[PDB]
Design an enzyme around this catalytic site. Structure first.
Site, PDB file in Angstrom:
ATOM      1  N   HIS A   1       0.832  -1.193   0.000  1.00  0.00           N
ATOM      2  CA  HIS A   1       0.000   0.000   0.000  1.00  0.00           C
ATOM      3  C   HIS A   1       0.871   1.248   0.000  1.00  0.00           C
ATOM      4  CE1 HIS A   1      -3.637  -2.354   0.647  1.00  0.00           C
ATOM      5  NE2 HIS A   1      -2.991  -3.017   1.590  1.00  0.00           N
TER       6      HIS A   1
HETATM    7  C1  LIG Z   1     -18.231  -8.474  -0.540  1.00  0.00           C
HETATM    8  C2  LIG Z   1     -17.818  -9.896  -0.911  1.00  0.00           C
HETATM    9  C3  LIG Z   1     -18.456 -10.874   0.049  1.00  0.00           C
HETATM   10  C4  LIG Z   1     -18.321 -10.269  -2.368  1.00  0.00           C
HETATM   11  O1  LIG Z   1     -19.466  -9.606  -2.614  1.00  0.00           O
HETATM   12  P1  LIG Z   1     -20.114  -9.358  -4.238  1.00  0.00           P
HETATM   13  O2  LIG Z   1     -18.933  -8.748  -4.926  1.00  0.00           O
HETATM   14  O3  LIG Z   1     -21.324  -8.567  -3.871  1.00  0.00           O
HETATM   15  O4  LIG Z   1     -20.256 -10.892  -4.528  1.00  0.00           O
HETATM   16  P2  LIG Z   1     -21.044 -12.130  -3.876  1.00  0.00           P
HETATM   17  O5  LIG Z   1     -20.442 -13.206  -4.722  1.00  0.00           O
HETATM   18  O6  LIG Z   1     -21.026 -12.079  -2.382  1.00  0.00           O
HETATM   19  O7  LIG Z   1     -22.569 -11.715  -4.380  1.00  0.00           O
HETATM   20  C5  LIG Z   1     -23.759 -12.168  -3.866  1.00  0.00           C
HETATM   21  C6  LIG Z   1     -24.785 -12.171  -5.024  1.00  0.00           C
HETATM   22  O8  LIG Z   1     -24.354 -11.280  -6.021  1.00  0.00           O
HETATM   23  C7  LIG Z   1     -24.954 -11.648  -7.242  1.00  0.00           C
HETATM   24  N1  LIG Z   1     -23.889 -11.662  -8.277  1.00  0.00           N
HETATM   25  C8  LIG Z   1     -22.508 -11.725  -8.034  1.00  0.00           C
HETATM   26  N2  LIG Z   1     -21.763 -11.724  -9.165  1.00  0.00           N
HETATM   27  C9  LIG Z   1     -22.714 -11.655 -10.189  1.00  0.00           C
HETATM   28  C10 LIG Z   1     -22.612 -11.620 -11.593  1.00  0.00           C
HETATM   29  N3  LIG Z   1     -21.375 -11.655 -12.193  1.00  0.00           N
HETATM   30  N4  LIG Z   1     -23.715 -11.554 -12.384  1.00  0.00           N
HETATM   31  C11 LIG Z   1     -24.926 -11.524 -11.718  1.00  0.00           C
HETATM   32  N5  LIG Z   1     -25.179 -11.550 -10.407  1.00  0.00           N
HETATM   33  C12 LIG Z   1     -24.036 -11.616  -9.647  1.00  0.00           C
HETATM   34  C13 LIG Z   1     -25.713 -13.027  -7.038  1.00  0.00           C
HETATM   35  O9  LIG Z   1     -27.069 -12.831  -6.861  1.00  0.00           O
HETATM   36  C14 LIG Z   1     -24.879 -13.524  -5.758  1.00  0.00           C
HETATM   37  O10 LIG Z   1     -25.662 -14.429  -5.108  1.00  0.00           O
HETATM   38  P3  LIG Z   1     -27.082 -14.041  -3.957  1.00  0.00           P
HETATM   39  O11 LIG Z   1     -27.825 -12.932  -4.674  1.00  0.00           O
HETATM   40  O12 LIG Z   1     -27.747 -15.396  -4.031  1.00  0.00           O
HETATM   41  O13 LIG Z   1     -26.364 -13.617  -2.703  1.00  0.00           O
HETATM   42  C15 LIG Z   1     -16.262  -9.962  -0.877  1.00  0.00           C
HETATM   43  O14 LIG Z   1     -15.761 -11.229  -1.198  1.00  0.00           O
HETATM   44  C16 LIG Z   1     -15.579  -8.804  -1.624  1.00  0.00           C
HETATM   45  O15 LIG Z   1     -16.001  -8.276  -2.638  1.00  0.00           O
HETATM   46  N6  LIG Z   1     -14.367  -8.343  -1.077  1.00  0.00           N
HETATM   47  C17 LIG Z   1     -13.767  -8.897   0.114  1.00  0.00           C
HETATM   48  C18 LIG Z   1     -12.243  -8.862  -0.083  1.00  0.00           C
HETATM   49  C19 LIG Z   1     -11.743  -7.434  -0.052  1.00  0.00           C
HETATM   50  O16 LIG Z   1     -12.459  -6.445  -0.047  1.00  0.00           O
HETATM   51  N7  LIG Z   1     -10.354  -7.296  -0.036  1.00  0.00           N
HETATM   52  C20 LIG Z   1      -9.707  -5.996  -0.007  1.00  0.00           C
HETATM   53  C21 LIG Z   1      -8.212  -6.196   0.241  1.00  0.00           C
HETATM   54  S1  LIG Z   1      -7.536  -4.579   0.724  1.00  0.00           S
END
Ligand SMILES: CC(C)(COP(=O)(O)OP(=O)(O)OC[C@H]1O[C@@H](n2cnc3c(N)ncnc32)[C@H](O)[C@@H]1OP(=O)(O)O)[C@@H](O)C(=O)NCCC(=O)NCCS
Ligand SMILES: CC(C)(COP(=O)(O)OP(=O)(O)OC[C@H]1O[C@@H](n2cnc3c(N)ncnc32)[C@H](O)[C@@H]1OP(=O)(O)O)[C@@H](O)C(=O)NCCC(=O)NCCS
Ligand SMILES: *[C@@H]1O[C@H](CO)[C@@H](O)[C@H](O)[C@H]1NC(C)=O
Ligand SMILES: *[C@@H]1O[C@H](CO)[C@@H](O)[C@H](O)[C@H]1NC(C)=O
Ligand SMILES: *[C@@H]1O[C@H](CO)[C@@H](O)[C@H](O)[C@H]1NC(C)=O
Ligand SMILES: *[C@@H]1O[C@H](CO)[C@@H](O)[C@H](O)[C@H]1NC(C)=O
Ligand SMILES: *[C@@H]1O[C@H](CO)[C@@H](O)[C@H](O)[C@H]1NC(C)=O
Ligand SMILES: *[C@@H]1O[C@H](CO)[C@@H](O)[C@H](O)[C@H]1NC(C)=O
Ligand SMILES: *[C@@H]1O[C@H](CO)[C@@H](O)[C@H](O)[C@H]1NC(C)=O
EC number: 2.3.1.78
Lengths: 550, 546
Positions: free
Chosen positions: B180
């Site tokens: 970072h």
């Molecule tokens: C927040 C986190 C849990 C993922 O969340 P997201 O990006 O919202 O993805 P998820 O896979 O949890 O999504 C949940 C829903 O999104 C929807 N979705 C996700 N990707 C999709 C896509 N490509 N197309 C359509 N719908 C999608 C679906 O509906 C999925 O299932 P649900 O509705 O049955 O819950 C997490 O893993 C993240 O993004 N970051 C954590 C790591 C981080 O921030 N690191 C930083 C290091 S400094």
């Protein structure tokens, strides 16, 4: 004063006789008198010189006060100190003739009770407190939803036994309140923590037979089942070595300082050996005709005569390698702890041949560097309780569990037959254990020992497990008086519970910073809370129908 | 010499002038010259007095040799030291200028380690993986013989972010560009989190509209949103934030903010906002391009108004809230930064708000600026004030989801919208930061989560979606094979790699701990193993979701 320690001020008023204090615990079978403190003679008449000592108060204390100028027994004391005491010990000569010397031990600060200051009173109080907190949390969840605004059947008896074992394991692995009877005994003897792993092996064997015979009864190629057995055993061994054994809070893993043996490695090797043996000698389970009869019917024993012959050969091999293997610089047939144990004449003989085999094959670096005897017998070598030689008795106990499964599923129609076989096996194993140990802790031909995984250890724990199954089968399965509630959720999520509690040993729900780490009550309540939280996690996973296997 | 260090032998041939060596890096914007070593005088002519100093060789080195007797400059050296060098510096009276020379040639540590060694390591890893797969398969064969759908482009982008996050969290070879940034500029490690928030918002809109098109009530979806936010916050507080290798958790010293806490708060905010203002996705036929239909913004006008109000609140709090013992509108890093006249001002308004609300103990005790600007106070990059900008970027991701869902039939419309939004956010960022770190109205800052930071990385995410939508979705030239496996197990990968930070497959004892090559190889192997675990779970159809 630290936890499980008592102050001891020795007041030596002798004018012309120096003293040194030797302390040896009562649990030491044959133990050297370790020095405690040196009390100099009184510089002037009527002005004794004193020193401060902290005698351990876990169990017993033998003090011998020897004159340093001439090594003679001035006096001896066999007193059981209590936690956080004072114990002003005065050493003086009787004024009647100024010749006889007697040391009188008097207590000034009364001991702070440790073993029974909590008791069932605090146990039920903590249970009520945690139940009330759980109910309040559940009610608060409903308040944020409705009041926020207007808007082959499973046994469950083997599951209950495995859940009891898991609860005990979670309690004693986290510390068990730091009590001396909730941790593994220093070499010989049996404690609460020593009962867990043999019960797990017994239940593993029972489940091995149950799953194997169910899979073969529905249908499967024995090669496919053999592949599943090999894959599961390999996964267990790898999981042990990678995530279960090492303590990663000390640093990265080293290729030359990794503990190869362990609980899960032993479980995997035992699983592979006994499951492959039973699969090779696999026969269909007959359906019993008579009911509450056929005392002489030993079908579950005679039909497994190759397995019994090979298990007896393995046990004879273990006995020969234990009582006959020539260990370099060590008596043959050694069963002692080494260090200061056995009068300290074999300081580096921890385990005898059982430890010698490990130190010869796996190397000294790849063993358990902190054995259970290191705190009492001050052993300096590394001994692994889950070693190579003890795997033979692990296999024997797993096959005893397989025999229990044979009993429980061969006679599935008649409950009386199952109970009779269970009580007969429990009595036989208890008689064998009595013969081997001579109902003594440190005596007998083969004393009970978790570190060596002795034959009598296996027989005693197998008799205990058979009695537990005898009292759990009618209660849970047949009569259904008590579907074992706080137990069978871990009974069905055992592998995940073990892996999680090893991985999450030090996490906020499971442990937190204490007001005083030198307190039995706080550690006890923390460990009970952690065990209850693991039971709750297992129950939640059961309610969500999440069952990790293999 | 430690890793990223260079020896410097300062020979003082001067006879009647003492010298002190002041060392300052080039990344520092306005840093006080930190002392390096005081070189005694030469006792006799022709016998200089030598002292050995280890100068940081990460990037740049400005040496100021003042005379401690009279505090005057004699020679200044703006020299970029190489790693593991010798670098004998000789000060001789001529003029009083001093000249620097190199004795041992430095190791590159960048070209030879990350030019062809990357290809070699990739080939070795592929060979090992294929051999492991074939050996088990051959052994089994030998014994047997004898006896709406997911976009996958958002998934590919999330997997790219996850691979980068796993690589840079494990250390990234202990490189300075994979860590970072020290309070300003952009590094490879500074891109993962805002991209994660952008993808979070896009998936928020995708999931919300997919659930609402099935007739599900808004109340059940609101309950699901609340439960997911609560679970994310609790997981971040308990499992991810604290280091349990140091000791048991104490409420007195526990980091309340974090990556998952910020993600949960922003998820709750933006998801509840777009659920309250939810509108059905209209059908689109048109012809070719829509020629700036702007329906996805006219239908998001009140959410956009609230987001702009939040942005104005962030700007007002940052540039107007009076921090006591600190200038109003402070953006500097404190410590020795900004000429060391504000020793405790890390964050200014954002840090002051964090310390006022959550307390000093419940923050990040090791901010990214501690190593370079020598900050003594605790600042949390995932604080409270920056949550506003995190919400704004989550809503920008929601806007991208609206773009890719409203114009689902027309790919040209989606590409035009993506390139227009990328250009708009890029121009906004260029205006804010003046395309120069440490300068401009709002410099790019991850710790403050600056508005220019959000706009820069939102333009980056829009460009990535522009180059990933046709290729992976429409044209099908690619399927994101090494990336879309973590794209479906993002939460599992994050939680596992936080729990399993130091485990044998991911971390092992190194022969030379002070070496970039070995650390880089270990981090790459760990990242590849996490990708392999994600692929295995994809094969088993195991997709843990909150
Ligand atoms: C927040 C986190 C849990 C993922 O969340 P997201 O990006 O919202 O993805 P998820 O896979 O949890 O999504 C949940 C829903 O999104 C929807 N979705 C996700 N990707 C999709 C896509 N490509 N197309 C359509 N719908 C999608 C679906 O509906 C999925 O299932 P649900 O509705 O049955 O819950 C997490 O893993 C993240 O993004 N970051 C954590 C790591 C981080 O921030 N690191 C930083 C290091 S400094
Ligand atoms: C290793 C361990 C998971 C093995 O457990 P098990 O007793 O073999 O139980 P599992 O649930 O693993 O059983 C595996 C098979 O038995 C079956 N089985 C388990 N209990 C059963 C029962 N009561 N009735 C019928 N079948 C049963 C399972 O269904 C599976 O069979 P399938 O493949 O047909 O489904 C277990 O002993 C454990 O968790 N140990 C913890 C480590 C330890 O011993 N620690 C102590 C030292 S601190
Ligand atoms: C112990 O006492 C004896 C005499 O009683 C004395 O000779 C000796 O020096 C003492 N040892 C010490 C003080 O260490
Ligand atoms: C103490 O003195 C007695 C004398 O009878 C001796 O037998 C014993 O071994 C001594 N203790 C130690 C630890 O040397
Ligand atoms: C033990 O008692 C003595 C006097 O009775 C006292 O001086 C000493 O402080 C006591 N021990 C402790 C640990 O307080
Ligand atoms: C016992 O082993 C230790 C190493 O653990 C060694 O230092 C010591 O000399 C050994 N003693 C004997 C009597 O072998
Ligand atoms: C070094 O000397 C110059 C002379 O002008 C001065 O400006 C500078 O502040 C000095 N360095 C430090 C660290 O004070
Ligand atoms: C230079 O520094 C040395 C320290 O080694 C000191 O002894 C000497 O007096 C200094 N010369 C001055 C201050 O002129
Ligand atoms: C730097 O070079 C000098 C002579 O060229 C040598 O004495 C010194 O050991 C070198 N530095 C290191 C760290 O070896």
């Amino acid at each position: 004063l630290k936890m499980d320690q008592a102050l001891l001020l020795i007041h030596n008023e002798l004018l012309w006789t120096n003293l040194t204090v030797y302390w040896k615990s009562e649990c030491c079978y044959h133990c050297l008198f370790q020095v405690l403190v040196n009390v100099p003679q009184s510089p002037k008449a009527g002005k004794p010189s004193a020193a401060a000592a902290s005698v351990s108060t876990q169990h017993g204390s033998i003090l011998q006060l020897n004159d340093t100028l001439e090594e003679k027994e001035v006096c001896r004391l066999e007193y059981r100190f209590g936690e956080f005491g004072n114990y002003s010990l005065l050493v003086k000569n009787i004024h009647n003739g100024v010749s006889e010397i007697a040391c009188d031990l008097a207590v000034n600060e009364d001991p702070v009770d440790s073993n029974l200051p909590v008791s069932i009173a605090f146990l039920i109080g903590l249970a009520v407190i945690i139940v009330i907190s759980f109910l309040r949390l559940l009610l608060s969840l409903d308040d944020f939803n409705n009041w926020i605004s207007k808007a082959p059947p499973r046994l469950r008896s083997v599951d209950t036994f495995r859940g009891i074992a898991l609860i005990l394991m979670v309690f004693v692995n986290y510390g068990g309140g730091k009590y001396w009877y909730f941790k593994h005994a220093s070499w010989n003897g049996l404690t609460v923590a020593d009962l867990v792993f043999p019960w797990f092996v017994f239940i593993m064997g029972s489940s091995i037979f149950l799953s194997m015979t169910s899979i073969l009864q529905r249908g499967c190629s024995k090669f496919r089942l053999l592949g599943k057995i090999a894959w599961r055993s390999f996964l267990l061994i790898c999981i042990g070595i990678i995530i279960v054994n090492p303590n990663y809070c000390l640093g990265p893993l080293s290729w030359d300082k990794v503990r190869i043996p362990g609980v899960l490695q032993r479980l995997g090797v035992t699983y592979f050996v006994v499951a492959v043996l039973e699969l090779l000698f696999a026969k269909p389970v007959p359906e019993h005709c008579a009911s509450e009869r056929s005392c002489l019917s030993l079908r579950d024993i005679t039909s497994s005569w190759p397995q019994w012959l090979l298990i007896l050969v393995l046990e004879g091999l273990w006995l020969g390698l234990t009582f006959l293997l020539p260990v370099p610089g060590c008596p043959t047939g050694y069963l002692g702890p080494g260090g200061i144990g056995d009068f300290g004449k074999y300081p580096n003989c921890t385990g005898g041949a059982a430890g010698y085999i490990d130190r010869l094959l796996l190397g000294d670096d790849h063993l358990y560097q902190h054995p259970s005897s290191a705190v009492l017998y001050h052993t300096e070598v590394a001994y692994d309780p889950e070693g190579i030689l003890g795997t033979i008795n692990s296999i024997v106990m797993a096959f005893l569990g397989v025999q229990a499964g044979k009993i429980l599923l061969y006679y599935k129609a008649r409950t009386k037959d199952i109970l009779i076989r269970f009580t007969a096996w429990c009595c036989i194993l208890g008689l064998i254990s009595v013969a081997l140990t001579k109902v003594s802790e440190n005596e007998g031909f083969i004393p009970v020992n978790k570190n060596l995984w002795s034959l009598s250890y296996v027989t005693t724990l197998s008799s205990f497990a058979f009695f537990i199954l005898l009292v759990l089968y009618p209660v849970v399965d047949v009569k259904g008086l008590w579907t074992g509630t706080p137990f069978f959720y871990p009974g069905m999520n055992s592998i995940l519970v073990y892996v999680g509690h090893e991985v999450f040993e030090n996490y906020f729900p499971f442990q937190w910073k204490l007001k005083d780490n030198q307190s039995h009550k706080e550690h006890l309540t923390q460990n009970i809370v952690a065990t209850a939280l693991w039971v709750l996690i297992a129950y939640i996973l059961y309610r969500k129908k999440i069952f990790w296997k293999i």
